[PDB]
Every structure is written in C-alpha cells, then in structure tokens.
Amino acid sequence: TVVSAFLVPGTPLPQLKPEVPSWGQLAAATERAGKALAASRPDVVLVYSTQWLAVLDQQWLTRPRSEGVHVDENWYEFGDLAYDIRADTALAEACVTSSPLHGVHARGVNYDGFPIDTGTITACTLMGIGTDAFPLVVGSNNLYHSGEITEKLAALAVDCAKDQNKRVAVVGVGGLSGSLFREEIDPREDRIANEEDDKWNRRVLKLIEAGDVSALREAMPVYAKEARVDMGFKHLHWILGALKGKFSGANVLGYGPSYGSGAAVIEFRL
Amino acid sequence: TVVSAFLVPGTPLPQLKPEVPSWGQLAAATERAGKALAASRPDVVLVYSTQWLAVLDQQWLTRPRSEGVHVDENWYEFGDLAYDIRADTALAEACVTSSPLHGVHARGVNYDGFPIDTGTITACTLMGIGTDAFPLVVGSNNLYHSGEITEKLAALAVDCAKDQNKRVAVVGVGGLSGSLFREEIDPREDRIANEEDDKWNRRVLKLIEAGDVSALREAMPVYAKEARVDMGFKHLHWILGALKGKFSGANVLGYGPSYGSGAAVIEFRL
Amino acid sequence: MQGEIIAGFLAPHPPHLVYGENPPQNEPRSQGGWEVLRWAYERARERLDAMKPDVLLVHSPHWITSVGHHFLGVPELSGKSVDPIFPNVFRYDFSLNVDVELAEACAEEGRKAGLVTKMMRNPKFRVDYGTITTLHLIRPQWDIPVVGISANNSPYYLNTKEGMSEMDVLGKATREAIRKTGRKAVLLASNTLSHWHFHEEPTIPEDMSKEYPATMAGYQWDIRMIELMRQGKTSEVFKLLPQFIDEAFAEVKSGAFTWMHAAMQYPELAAELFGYGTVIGTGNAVMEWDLRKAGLSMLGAADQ
Amino acid sequence: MQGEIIAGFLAPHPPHLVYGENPPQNEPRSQGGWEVLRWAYERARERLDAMKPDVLLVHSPHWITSVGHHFLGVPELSGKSVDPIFPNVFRYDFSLNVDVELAEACAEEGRKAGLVTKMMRNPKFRVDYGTITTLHLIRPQWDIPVVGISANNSPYYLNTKEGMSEMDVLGKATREAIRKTGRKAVLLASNTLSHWHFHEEPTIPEDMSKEYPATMAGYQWDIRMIELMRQGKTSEVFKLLPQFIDEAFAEVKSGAFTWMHAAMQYPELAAELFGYGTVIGTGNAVMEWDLRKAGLSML
Numbered sequence A, B: 001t002v003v004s005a006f007l008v009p010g011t012p013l014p015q016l017k018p019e020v021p022s023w024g025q026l027a028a029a030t031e032r033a034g035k036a037l038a039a040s041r042p043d044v045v046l047v048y049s050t051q052w053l054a055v056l057d058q059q060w061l062t063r064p065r066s067e068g069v070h071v072d073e074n075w076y077e078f079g080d081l082a083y084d085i086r087a088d089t090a091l092a093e094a095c096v097t098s099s100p101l102h103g104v105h106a107r108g109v110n111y112d113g114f115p116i117d118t119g120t121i122t123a124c125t126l127m128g129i130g131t132d133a134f135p136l137v138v139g140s141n142n143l144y145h146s147g148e149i150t151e152k153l154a155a156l157a158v159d160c161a162k163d164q165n166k167r168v169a170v171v172g173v174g175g176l177s178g179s180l181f182r183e184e185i186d187p188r189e190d191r192i193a194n195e196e197d198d199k200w201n202r203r204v205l206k207l208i209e210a211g212d213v214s215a216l217r218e219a220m221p222v223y224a225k226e227a228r229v230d231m232g233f234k235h236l237h238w239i240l241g242a243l244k245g246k247f248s249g250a251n252v253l254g255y256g257p258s259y260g261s262g263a264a265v266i267e268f269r270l
Numbered sequence C: 001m002q003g004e005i006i007a008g009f010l011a012p013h014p015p016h017l018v019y020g021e022n023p024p025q026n027e028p029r030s031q032g033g034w035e036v037l038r039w040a041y042e043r044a045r046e047r048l049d050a051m052k053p054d055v056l057l058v059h060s061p062h063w064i065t066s067v068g069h070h071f072l073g074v075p076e077l078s079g080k081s082v083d084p085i086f087p088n089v090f091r092y093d094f095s096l097n098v099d100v101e102l103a104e105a106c107a108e109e110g111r112k113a114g115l116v117t118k119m120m121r122n123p124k125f126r127v128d129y130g131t132i133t134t135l136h137l138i139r140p141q142w143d144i145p146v147v148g149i150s151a152n153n154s155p156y157y158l159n160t161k162e163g164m165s166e167m168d169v170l171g172k173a174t175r176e177a178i179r180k181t182g183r184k185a186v187l188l189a190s191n192t193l194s195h196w197h198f199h200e201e202p203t204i205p206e207d208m209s210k211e212y213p214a215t216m217a218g219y220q221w222d223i224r225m226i227e228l229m230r231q232g233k234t235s236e237v238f239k240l241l242p243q244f245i246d247e248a249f250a251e252v253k254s255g256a257f258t259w260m261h262a263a264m265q266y267p268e269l270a271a272e273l274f275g276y277g278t279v280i281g282t283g284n285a286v287m288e289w290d291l292r293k294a295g296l297s298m299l300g301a302a303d304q
Numbered sequence D: 001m002q003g004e005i006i007a008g009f010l011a012p013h014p015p016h017l018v019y020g021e022n023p024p025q026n027e028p029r030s031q032g033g034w035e036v037l038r039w040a041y042e043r044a045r046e047r048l049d050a051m052k053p054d055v056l057l058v059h060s061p062h063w064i065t066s067v068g069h070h071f072l073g074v075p076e077l078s079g080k081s082v083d084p085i086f087p088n089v090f091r092y093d094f095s096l097n098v099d100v101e102l103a104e105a106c107a108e109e110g111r112k113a114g115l116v117t118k119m120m121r122n123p124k125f126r127v128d129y130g131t132i133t134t135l136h137l138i139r140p141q142w143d144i145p146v147v148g149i150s151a152n153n154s155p156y157y158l159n160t161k162e163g164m165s166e167m168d169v170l171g172k173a174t175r176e177a178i179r180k181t182g183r184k185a186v187l188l189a190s191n192t193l194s195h196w197h198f199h200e201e202p203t204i205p206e207d208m209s210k211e212y213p214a215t216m217a218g219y220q221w222d223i224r225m226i227e228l229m230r231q232g233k234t235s236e237v238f239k240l241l242p243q244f245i246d247e248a249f250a251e252v253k254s255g256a257f258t259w260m261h262a263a264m265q266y267p268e269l270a271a272e273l274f275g276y277g278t279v280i281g282t283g284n285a286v287m288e289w290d291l292r293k294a295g296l297s298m299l
C-alpha cells in the first residue's frame, strides 16, 4: 500500500526566499520530490511534521478542508504562507479510532481557523500536496511521544489505509541538525553552523542512502543529541514505522543550510 | 462465648439525679443489669453507644485507659460524669483489622483526652463495667451505617472474641422513643412525651420479652420511624448481631421516661 | 452609647484548617495544608483586627441541643478540645473568655421573643470543636471575649422551614441584645456549604493532590450561592436556601447563616469573598458583610 | 514627563479561564469553571482599573523565538486565535492596539544592551493564546494599549542560568524604555507555576471535582514559593528559582517572571496573592507587586 516515501524540510526559508542560492536549491529539490510523489500515484498522503505540537494526546487532522494565510512566528519578514489543505476524513477518523487500541489516546481535530504548522504548509506548497487529488492524514507531534510511539503511530495509519484499500505516500517533515544561529545574519552567507553538525548530517544521510536500517537505528539517538536534531528525528521514525522498519535504499535530492540549521530532501527507494 | 446481653439507657439523668423517683428506678435497674452482667463471668464487654458518633470510618476504642470528667452538652445542669474506662486493647485492635475483611473501613482510637460519649460513661458507672476486670471493646455509631451493617459489626467482634477464647458480655447503649420535651419541665413531672410513643415502647418491649425475633424484626423500622427511636434502634441491632439473630426471652428490669424520651433496661435470656 | 453589629462573617470550621497552621495550642504536627482556605482566613483576620470588637458571637453546629437554645454562661472556660472524628488532626488546648453579660441578654431577649433559652453554668464544660476552630481561624490571639450559642435541633427534629424560623427569631433577639447592651459585636456563622463528602481520608491528610470537590453538583450549588452573595442579592440567596439544603446537603441547615443574617436584618449588600476551597470534598467559603463600610451597623440607643 | 511602572502582576494564562468566563470573543460555551482563579482575576481587574495606565507590557511563553527577543510592532492587530492544543476550549476573535512607539524603544534599548531584537511588523500575525488570555483576564475591556514581547529560546536552548541572564537584561532594558519615553506602564508576567501534569482531560472540562494538583510536591513547591513572595523575600525566591524550575517544572523558566522583576529591580516588597488554583493539574497563582503604593514606581 505504501507506494512512495519522502523526508522534506519543515523550514519556510526555501519557499519564502528562494533567491538565496542554497535555499533556492532546497526549494528546487522539494519541488522535484513533488514530481516523484505524483508519479507514484497515491490516494492519501501520510504527513507528519515536527512543528505540529500536541501535549495532551495524539491529534489527527480531521477537517475536510483547511485554508488561510499563515505567518511564521519566527520568519514573518520574508512573506506569508497561504494554504489550502484537504484531508482524507475517512482515514483520519479511522486513525483516531485505531489509536487508543494501540495504547495511544487520540482525538480528531476539526475547527475553523485551526492553525496548521509552517512545516505542513511549506511541504504542501512546494511538493504540490494536500490537494483533492492527494489529500492528507496529518498526525501531530506529541511532545511526550517517543520515536517508538511515532513508529507505532505511522504503522497504525498504514494499516488503517490497508483495510480501506488505498495507496499511501509517506512524508516526514522536519530538519536535520538544529544549531540555529542566535543573531541575525546576511541570508546570502547562511551556512551550516558547525562542521561537527555538517559531518554528522553527511554521515547519517549516507546511512540513509545505503539503507542500513540497523546502523541508522543506533546512530539516531546519538546523532539527535549531538547535532540537536529537530525533535529527536521523530519525523524519520515516522517514515521507518510506515515502512515497518524496512527499506532498500534512498536518494538525496538536496542538502543545505537553514540559518545554521541542517535541511535536506530525501526520496526513499522502497 | 456470648454469656450475657443487655440493653441500657444512654441518658445520664438516671445516674445524675436519682432523687427523681422514675429516674432512680431506671438507675437501680441498670445496676441490677450490671450485677447480672458480673454473674455471667465475662472476660470482655462488647459495647455500642448511640451517642458515640462517627462519620468517616468505624472507630473502635483502643486506648488501654481513658479517664476524665465528662459534662453532657444537653444535661450539664444535673452534674458531671467522672470516669475511668479500660479497653481490651488486644480484642479492640483485632476488631480494627477485621472490620474491612467484612467490608467496613475502620481505625483504632487512642488519644489522650478523647471524649468518651455520655452513654458509655453512664453505663460503665451504673453497671460497674469498663474496669480492668470487665474491660471494654467499644465500637462507634457511624451515621452512615445501617442496622444490617451494625449487626455484621457486632457479629465480627463476637467472632474475634472466639479467636481469643474470651467470654463476651454484650451491651447496647441507648434510648427507646425519642420525642424529648422541647421546653424545660419539673424533673419530678417527667413522663413519656406522648401516648403513641408509650404504646410503641410497650409493644416492642413485649415482643422482646416474649422472644419473637421475627415479629421484632418486622416492627423495628416502623417503630424507629414512628416513635423517633434513638438512632434507628441500631443499639438493638448491635445486640441482635452479637446473638446471631437468636434469643429465648428477655426481662425488662425497668421502663420509664427521660425528659419525654423513653428508656428501658433489658436483660436478654440467650 | 450605641449598640453595633460591626460585621458578619461566614467562618467555616473544618479542623483541618487549624491543623495546617501548626499553632501552639494544637497538639498534632502537620506539613502545611489547605493554604487557599488558610490565606482566605488571613484577610478575614486582618479585617477584624481593624474592628477591635467588644465581642465575637458564634453559632456552632457542633453544640447540638434539644431543649431550646443555649448560651455559654461562665466567665472563663478552658480545656483540651479533641475532635471525635479527626482526633488525628485536632487536639486543641483552649482557654477563652465569655461575655456573660451579653450572653444573658441574648437568653433574656430570646425568651421574651417566644424561644426557650438556657444558660450554660457548668464550669467543667468542654467547648465544642467547631466553636474553637472558627474562633482560632478568625482570632488566634484569644483576646476578644466571646458569646457561644448552641445550634437547636429544630431544623432536624421538626423540619427545615420551622427550624429556620427559630433561627430567625434568635437572630432578631441577638440584635436586640447587642443594642440594649450597646456592644460592638462581630457575628460568626460557623457554617460549611455543600457537605456531600467522601468517607475516606488519605495517608497524609495534608496531601493536597488528594483534595477536591466531592461532587460537581455540590461545587456548582456553592458557586451559584456565593456568586449571589457577591452580587448582594440576599433575598435571592434565602429563597434558594431550602433547595440548597436539600440538594447540596449544606451545613447552613444548622442555622448559623440564618441567625447571622436575621441579626443583620438581611442586608441587600455585597459580600466580600476571601476564598473558596474544599476540605474532605466539602465546600467552604470565608466571607464578610461589612456593615460599617455600608453604614448599617448602628442599631440604636442603649439602655440604662 | 517621567516614566512609571505602577505594578507588576503574575498573571497566568490557562485558556480554560477565558473558557470559563463565556465572553463574546470566545466561540465555545462552558458551564462555568475555575471560579476560584477567576475570582482571583476579579481582584486583579479592579486593582488595574484604579491605576489608569498608558500601556500593558506582557511577556508570553507561547510566542517562542529562536533569533532574539521580538516585539509586536503593528498599530492594530486583529484575528482569530485558535489554540493548537486546546481548540475545544479556546477560539478567540481578538482585536488589540499596540504601543508601537514603546515597543520600538524596548527593542532599541535591548539592542543597545547586547541583546538581539526584532520588531514584528507583519499585519497578519496570529497572536498567541497566552498573550490573548492574560490580557483578557486582567482587562477584558480591550482598551489599554499593549506591548507583546516574545519569549526567547535561551533558557531551553542554552541553559537556565544563561537564559535567565538574557531575560534579566531584557527587564533592565524595558525599564529604560519606559523611563526614556515617560510611559505609565504595568508589567504582566504571563507565567504559570508547577507544570508537571496528568494526561487526563475530563469528558466535560469544567468538572471541578476532577480538578486538583497533579503532584503533592508540585503543590508544596508552589506554596513555598508564593509564601516567600507574599513575605517580601524576593532575593530568596530568586535564589530558589533554579531548583524550583528543575523539580516543579515551572513555566517561569520561559522568562517572564525574571523579566518583570528585573524591570522593577528585584524589589524586597511583599506581594498580594489574589488566589492560587490548579488547571489540568498545573499550579496557577494570580499575584501583584504594588510599586506605586510602596513608592518605588518612579523611574
């Protein structure tokens, strides 16, 4: 049922200011991942973003159609973020019901003007997703959830997609190393904060390319701590859980900086 | 194990002002019951008083020796009630632990200056109990306990006594009909407040004398309600539960008024 | 000289409140507790300190009498008040002074109004746990003299409506007694609100993570009533007092609330809420009716 | 024309408090709730009303910024604030006015003092629920102008000591901004206390019989601290703040509490508690430091 898999950046800087060459490349690479997405002919898109924060219990987006203009609470000077996002209401509501059976309290989320996070929006815009052709089943990033639980959450959704007989594209939205610069820089001279962050990204990115699930699995908890990886890399656990801890190789379409932070676009070879 | 059973008044008036003839008669009858008590050579005296109020859990007297001068909060004009009461701590503590094993939360009570109720005090004085020879196991009157609950509480204490090879005398302390005069009277003019109460008293007292447990069981809740009987007549329930719902007859040693309320001394023939 | 009811306080008496303050007089030691209700009492304490009243009058539910309404009548009373229900939290060494003169005047006036009244003359008497608590929570100095009144059976033995009338007559007689003696008095309705509660206390009674309202329906009655007290819609709170009693099982059934308000002539005045909290699931509110700050405190010309 | 900090409030922002009020701005209906904490905010409201200030300043934990300390800087901000965590209880149509001139002066002063600052000039900005809530609870009239200040990342990203230090400099710079502009300002620390909580949301949220402290130690920590506060032992709370953060998981880590006190200059003045109470197990205290009445309000 899972026919496609991707990891993309949840930073808005590539979409907002693609005139910066490195960010321009990140944007181009997320767009190229969109063609690869479409060509896989999915019915639903299993989306997880690191910026969709929940605390009480697991939240699933159940609102048929969400639209508006989002302003990033950090990057509001580089423009706005219009969005029009469709949801697979049947899958989402099923995910809500399937959730407490697997040991995770969940609730559907359907409210007018509910804030969809920057990550989900930028990946929709750039990848051309969340349209009526490719609706979403977005799961929140609960702060108290572990990568274990996140994997269980993604799996649970693939299995909910199986008995509705639907083709699934998986997208985990989030960054790599998270050493954000703490002063304002010239965006044209944005680079990766350290070389330690750079080497770590390069390394774990190479383990993704080779598809060494086992070496990746053990590098993950150390990498997450040592490179301040966006939310402990739970947006990769999402992709692993969706593929039930198994994938061949992978393809890296882009890797650059986002204000000292590491960002990358990865197409997964199933 | 159970060798003796008695019902005595909780009112202090008979001991406080026995110069009032009727009151003097009730005191002399309680004294007679005390002698019948001692003649049955018990090891412990199991006591329940209507005026020992509890709200949370069941309380049992676990202090080896309580002494003080108690002054009744209604009848303070008639004098003071000095006391020196001994508890069978070994048996009392057994009742504490055994009570939840019959579905009743309970605590021991062992606090210097803990107020023993008027009923327990007056009964001890007139009956010559609560001494080191006739120590007490006193169980509280919990407001939320029914008669059924009170019987199970008494049977349980009689149980614990068999486990310690102890001869039990049983004393239920409290009044009969309870329509106390609501204005000051001349104590010499004391009489049962009304005829309906007098009839009710005589009727159930006759059922007790005869030994008709069945008839007595059916009349009790009607009698309690109609003649405003002291605390639902749970003090008789106490005696019944200790006797496992069985007794042969009864001698009513005294029946008289107590400021309009009714009061009797009853010796039970096992 | 002119008689004066300076103010009327609603002053709940759950003994856990003194337990948590660890005063010298109480024997058992606590690790704090119920500080919302205890801070609520801090304000009440300072409001009363600035009244310097001649006398505090308290009507306690925990001195129950059948033959009319009783009044403390010995100049000095002392003892160790141990609470029959929670002796683990309350064992208080008290010593107080009674305004015998005003107490006798209350009896006198209550008798003339058609009530049966009695003076408590036994010096060996042990003041009830409820009185000792309300007094300490409002006045830990034990420096103002007190008049302690019993709660007559009426509302339980007869019925609520009929018993409530006795408490009203008693309140009117209390006012009349104050005005004739020319005393500067503070009235203390020692009442709790919703009283549904749970019959089980935890390992550590002070454990505040285990303290909460017993019922939602109870808490709601309380709020609604203390809101109406805040709005100053008194006539509305008394029209609701019967249903409040039935449904929330309120301790105002004992009559201290009606006694107080009757003595204050049921002022349609706003009441200040110092705080609301639960003790053993039980609803409690510390409140004040400032009659001076409203100019309704003066009663009239004194006698003699 | 000389500046004044009339007072600083500890003004927590659980959205249930506005939910409990059933205002026109908030969409969902409640059956009441958290009346103790609301009655605390009754005493806050009238204490504020008798101050007549030019501006309210508020530092909110729910506008988290990575690069410096941001300031609201648009004359009129409007919108619909739906809380991402509690959208069932909080969906609020806000309409507020910003003291842009003062916001800019705070930003310039912060910049001058070594901090990185930015002005939020985007007219479509969605104001966080913490800012919207605290303000509506202390002044539902929506009339006094406001400066919304973001909570910089530093205490979480660097560590507590460095974060607090940054937050202190921000406080000192805020004082300077008030004095240089001769504003009559009230400070609002939008912080809750013990945040260690349970994950159980009652079927009907307002059910107050389901509301209680999450941990005994949480409550005890909250009490010890606010008891030191009403004592006027300010130095001693700030000595205990690191340990209070670590063990009670208190939201004063976000920084508003340090910011406010630094701006008042850590006054050894006893505070007035309008009430403590819990929301979803969290510790919430509504307090005030009356600087005018203590005569330390002139800059």
Ligand SMILES: O=[N+]([O-])c1ccc(O)c(O)c1
Pocket (backbone or CB within 6 Å): C013, C014, C015, C016, C086, C130, C191, C192, C251, C279, C280, C282
């Ligand atoms: O908790 N207690 O101990 C209580 C609570 C309410 C009361 O009215 C009382 O007399 C005692």
Ligand SMILES: O=[N+]([O-])c1ccc(O)c(O)c1
Pocket (backbone or CB within 6 Å): D013, D014, D015, D016, D086, D130, D191, D192, D251, D279, D280, D282
């Ligand atoms: O219960 N809530 O909704 C809360 C409680 C504490 C907080 O600091 C908050 O931001 C929300």
Ligand SMILES: [Fe+3]
Pocket (backbone or CB within 6 Å): C013, C061, C062, C130, C192, C251
């Ligand atoms: Fe009480």
Ligand SMILES: [Fe+3]
Pocket (backbone or CB within 6 Å): D013, D061, D062, D130, D192, D251
């Ligand atoms: Fe918060």
